[PDB]
Amino acid sequence: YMPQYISLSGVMTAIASFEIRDQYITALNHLVLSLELPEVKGMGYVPYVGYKCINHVSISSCNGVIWEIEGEELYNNCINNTIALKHSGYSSELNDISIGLTPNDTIKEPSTVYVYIKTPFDVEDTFSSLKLSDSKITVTVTFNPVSDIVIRDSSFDFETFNKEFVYVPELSFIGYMVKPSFIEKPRRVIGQINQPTATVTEVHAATSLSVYTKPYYGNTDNKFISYPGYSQDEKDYIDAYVSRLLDDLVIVSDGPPTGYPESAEIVEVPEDGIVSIQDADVYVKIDNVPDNMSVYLHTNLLMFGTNSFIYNISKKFSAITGTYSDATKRTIFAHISHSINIIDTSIPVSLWTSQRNVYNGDNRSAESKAKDLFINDPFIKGIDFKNKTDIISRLEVRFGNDVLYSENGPISRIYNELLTKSNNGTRTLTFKLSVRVVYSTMDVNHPIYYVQKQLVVVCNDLYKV
Amino acid sequence: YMPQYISLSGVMTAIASFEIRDQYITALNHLVLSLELPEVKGMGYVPYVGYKCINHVSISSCNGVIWEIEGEELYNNCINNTIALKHSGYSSELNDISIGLTPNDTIKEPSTVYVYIKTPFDVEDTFSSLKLSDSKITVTVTFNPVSDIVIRDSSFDFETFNKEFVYVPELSFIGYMVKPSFIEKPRRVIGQINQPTATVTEVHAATSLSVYTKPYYGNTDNKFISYPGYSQDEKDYIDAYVSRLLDDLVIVSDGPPTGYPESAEIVEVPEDGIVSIQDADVYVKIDNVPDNMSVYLHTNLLMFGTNSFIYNISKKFSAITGTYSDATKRTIFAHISHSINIIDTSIPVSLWTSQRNVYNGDNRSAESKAKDLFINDPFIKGIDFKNKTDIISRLEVRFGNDVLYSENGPISRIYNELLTKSNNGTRTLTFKLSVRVVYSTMDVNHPIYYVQKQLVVVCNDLYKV
Amino acid sequence: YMPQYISLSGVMTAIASFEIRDQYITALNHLVLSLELPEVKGMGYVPYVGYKCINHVSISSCNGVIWEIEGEELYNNCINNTIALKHSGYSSELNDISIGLTPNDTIKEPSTVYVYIKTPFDVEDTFSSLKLSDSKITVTVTFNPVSDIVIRDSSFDFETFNKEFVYVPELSFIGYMVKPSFIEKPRRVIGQINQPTATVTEVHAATSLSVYTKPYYGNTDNKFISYPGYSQDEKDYIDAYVSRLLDDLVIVSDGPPTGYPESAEIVEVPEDGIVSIQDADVYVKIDNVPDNMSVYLHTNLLMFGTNSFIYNISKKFSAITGTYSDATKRTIFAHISHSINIIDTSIPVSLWTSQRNVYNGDNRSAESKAKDLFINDPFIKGIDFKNKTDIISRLEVRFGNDVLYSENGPISRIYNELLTKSNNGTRTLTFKLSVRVVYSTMDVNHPIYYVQKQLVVVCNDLYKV
């Protein structure tokens, strides 16, 4: 045999179609989709932008579909491949939130991303390769709306960007100029919103079953206070959020601070430095405060309650130190002691100002609210951005009416992670199927309780080729 | 066959026993121990807390022990498995040193850790699995005292914590409902304190020999000035230590600083900014110093000598810059130029104030001394927390009376690390055995010279199954 | 068989020769070269110092060369082996730029580095090992001048260091006391300076072809403004550079700042804080400025042009905030907003002050210019230190007169990286050969346009053993 890297352009309908047929292409594998990202001008991309574009991939012959996959499941299959993820687009250039100051300003420079479309034909290189029995093979890529792969504020003219944006793809593969086999086709079932059950029918020969949760943000405008950009650690998310709150939390002003809702409770800090918000004490000490000015603490920046308990973000701070700058008229914060977590950074702004909330909700300045970001990432899992919180308390799997498997702790996720050497595993059973979960309880007084959930069940069926 | 994840509770005696016997469990492998950590309340856990709990693991049948291992050797076998180590417990939640301010305050939230008990039955999955010849298999886990897995200060009521703490384990394994083999059983020999020799008797069929050193802290109270928490890099250890010394090293005071031992030599910094401690010059410059106050340098914060040479921590600083805060009455340090290393951060406080020391030793404030931490981690290697310093100068291995192997440089550690793709290797010979080492010399005037050492020799014997 | 780690000293001629012959050494593999680095005294090493020493390695028998490799190609073959690279020497101890203040001061402590000499005899351990047919095997290591592995300033007495420095090597290997095979011998061709073509003649049986670019710094003194040391990320390089410029960029002075060339345009910052450099606005605001002093902005710190466009480093800054220190008489910079990139940090100082430049070029203080570093790393790729910029726009490969392969985008680099699980791949064709590239265009007004390029083509030929 002789291998060759072959690249094809395709027809755009957003859906891209690529036709493979050549007297010398006997076999093929290792599909890679290229995407040309445009120059973005005017007044950031999600991490792994290339994978997030993909809605669905289908491989077909004259006899029909040979193999197909949902975009999220392809991404899940490549999540433990750092190289493939880097090629997708993961950089400060693509993923940091850039700002356009003038209508002619360049926000993002043009770039190319590469999406490794992992197929069952790559497992054993030439041995597993797709053979083309003088057949025409069609590769069909369905794209997600560009709204899903972009993080932006209200100021950005998304309407025009959406109208003008076009997917520019190219398909590459390793062709080979040169026995029956088996292939596993992933099948996905999504449960009804908040329903802790899902069923996979016609299970006759399954190699594995995976169970996970996705948040549903349909009851929101998909706006979040902060986003850390390229820096994706749990701490980066928390630091970006604390940073966004600080300029409204501690104010150096000549008289009571203006520009805040009437619902805002901004209190002058005593000589002591301690402000008491019920049971919580906040120690605030700012250096170089001008003589005509005082230090103020916003005691209800974000507040939620269903006369009952109050989830107050201002109460999550215990110490705030800094120095006022006479030159820039800002407080330059130094050390901050808080108890902010990954869940707080994952609360949509809509849930703070929801109908269930008896309070205003959001007592930030208009300047802070204008800086909020629309995040529509299509592959979010759990109830937080890092999928850190495990919300499944118990899992039961039934084969027919009999209990096939049951667990409390995620011991099936621990084994998945150990056996596949992955740090991003799911509750998986490796070998009809009915899945029932018991969700963990977060307070009814926590805004996160109101994030909608969807149960996802993935089944891999065995097929003869 | 058909695999199944089976979980068992066990009997507590601290020793946990788990009995495996089922007409359908034909074979098993991949043992995982779960541990429920309690809520810690009142006025941090070691990294890889789950592995550090284990004292010994034994697998037995009616015919006796099939396989057994010392806790440290199990940990050593899993040290290159990042996933297994993460599952053990390695997070900011578990490993950062948290503070309890009131008797009802929550220091640590409850959590579950998972310990992968790597056995010779996992190497080739089903091919290497332990077969149960209608036999009852007993798994016995011996636990370390909780004192070993916890990092705390004097203020923490350890007495009550120890009395109330209980190990809550559960054993999981992959069971299989379905020829003679060979297995390697690790055997460990620990030399006499400071003795540079150790012998393994009855060596007939060994697959490998490993040699390493452990510090012995019996001549101390196991108290250290600092600990970096979850951040475990060499730099994190050094930064945590420098940070702890700084508030006693440079003092902004109205008149000579009070609250220090009479042995303390606190000198006013000249207009020049340079203080000379013998041959060492320390440049100290603090901004916003009040008119009624002066800048002072502690010239003997920690001092050790056996009229001879002096190991002085204050002499390890060349430049200290900062700004005094009128609001908090503290110096907010900016840039620090020092020559502090990993060894300095690994010196037990006991060795500064030892009988060999002709000086007081420890001239820190009572506030600083109260913040010291008890560290009893059972798996420490070398003479520093990172096992960075190689203290073996030469190694000789004898098979009977003949020299089997000898080396100066750790070329056997370099090969171990290259061949096993590990960054945490030991001097290893891969294939009676007498090991003799020559230890490197650190100054007799260095407190670290007085850290006791133990030679550890691990031998893997071949057994027929 | 029985394996043994054998170490040999060798003869120094710089060229080291090692002779292997023993009645009991039947086979061998896994060559490791040890190097003793000396104590460096007076008034930093390149990362992977051990690999950068090697110019060439040759393995010979009585019948001639068995296998040989160029130092850069050995390094390229080991670039995806983190362990081997660490052993080479990659630490803060070796790679941070240390300073000697007195002629008796220790800049670097002595150390040992280990260079894994990867050979085709290591692929399948004993199966691929080199068999010694009662033959004498000679290993010849040719070393690079020490000038290549050292990063230093003008103050360092390199002349004396070079005269006194000696390579102290030792060769280790795994010997074994105990059918025809095939081995791939790498062959490298370097094109003429700036020539976008290269040819490999006598190609009869090649397993692969790799193509990459190297900068040629012969038209320079090999001096760069900054180097980040051990911290090697793109951001570390950028931060080190910004940091070096800042003290000349914003000056707090009593009257117009002195000590700058007459070509320097240092402007007083208005009360507004905004300085306009043509189309670019720089916001500069410094706190605690003494009453007798003003804030100045260097508006042409580094300037390049061929009455035309100007590449001005001062125009790459949009916001500079800080606080003046009365104690140290320095500005302590806080937040900086700039558009500095990896290319700016990779510009040799010679290109700023080149004949093509109609401007002075370099309007920094003498203090800043004295801090410049000589970097002679022999394995640099592309036109920047991180090899981030892809300067090949199109690649064409011809086998005879026929086009074997052609590409625009680096799809052959993407496949190399995916198939070899490497994040440091090259445009590679895996299976006479003529390579032609089209280089991308950077502005003629950019100093980087004048960095000389060399096309490198690597061919692996099949040999029978």
Residue numbers in the entry:
A (entry chain A), B (entry chain A), C (entry chain A): 32 to 44, 52 to 81, 85 to 219, 225 to 352, 355 to 479, 502 to 535
The authors write:
The crescents are covered by a protein scaffold that is primarily comprised of the D13 protein. This protein has no predicted trans-membrane domain and requires the N-terminal region of the A17 integral membrane protein to form a honeycomb lattice on the external surface of crescents and IVs. The crystal structure of vaccinia virus D13 reveals a double-barrel organization that consists of two jellyrolls (J1 and J2) decorated by another β-sandwich forming the head domain.
We determined the crystal structure of both native D13 and D13D513G. The two models only differ in minor loop movements although several loops could not be modeled in the native D13 structure because of its lower resolution. The two structures have an r.m.s.d. of 0.5 Å for all equivalent atoms.
